[PDB]
């Protein structure tokens, strides 16, 4: 007879995830400032990572955290990102204190808990940008033409963050962002 696995196994995640850090240092290229922190694939190992690293609200201006599925680099040129886009959450300066860390942790829980059900495979990762003008959080998905998947992810994400219905969030294609003239990227979808 063998031991009961409930008593001793770590609780596995559906996916292995990688957390990346972007350091604002303009003596270097964007790609060289983006570096891996570590990977995890259980609930326990997730918390061991999260509990020892700085809250987003404490990072220096211009830094990022990115959590992406193992094998997807947190850059839009990745084969799994290049045809996709992101649901973008823009925060005002006052929301760094009130909402930034709570929203980012909720984003992490949505990813590692596979909270988008049959559209989980469309999720690539998420990014938090710490910025003086206003922080941003985004969930990246793999294909901007997967209308059903993209819309479901957006609606569920907005509910999980607890945004009031009046607050509109937008989905922006990476290719649109990379090719637009002027500073606005249009939204392919809103929710």
């Amino acid at each position: 007879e063998v031991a009961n696995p409930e008593h001793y196994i770590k609780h596995p995640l559906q996916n292995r995830w990688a957390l990346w850090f972007f350091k604002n240092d303009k003596s270097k290229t964007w790609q060289a400032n983006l570096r891996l922190i570590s990977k995890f694939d259980t609930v326990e190992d997730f918390w061991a990572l999260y509990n020892h690293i700085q809250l987003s609200s404490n990072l220096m201006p211009g830094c990022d955290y990115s959590l992406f599925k193992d094998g997807i680099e947190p850059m839009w040129e990745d084969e799994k990102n290049k045809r996709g886009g992101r649901w973008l959450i823009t925060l005002n300066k006052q929301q760094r204190r009130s909402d930034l860390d709570r929203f980012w942790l909720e984003t992490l829980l949505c990813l590692i808990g596979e909270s988008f059900d049959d559209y989980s495979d469309d999720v690539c990762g998420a990014v938090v940008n710490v910025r003086a003008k206003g922080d941003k959080i985004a969930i990246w998905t793999t294909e901007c033409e997967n209308r059903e998947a993209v819309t479901h992810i957006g609606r569920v994400y907005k509910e999980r963050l607890g945004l009031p219905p009046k607050i509109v969030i937008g989905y922006q294609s990476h290719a649109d962002t990379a090719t637009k003239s002027g500073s606005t990227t249009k939204n392919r979808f809103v929710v």
Partner: peptide, 14 residues
């Protein structure tokens, strides 16, 4: 698939 509720996940934080 392994799916987890937010409160289940939060129970392991401490």
């Amino acid at each position: 698939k392994k799916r987890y509720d937010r409160e289940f996940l939060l129970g392991f934080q401490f």
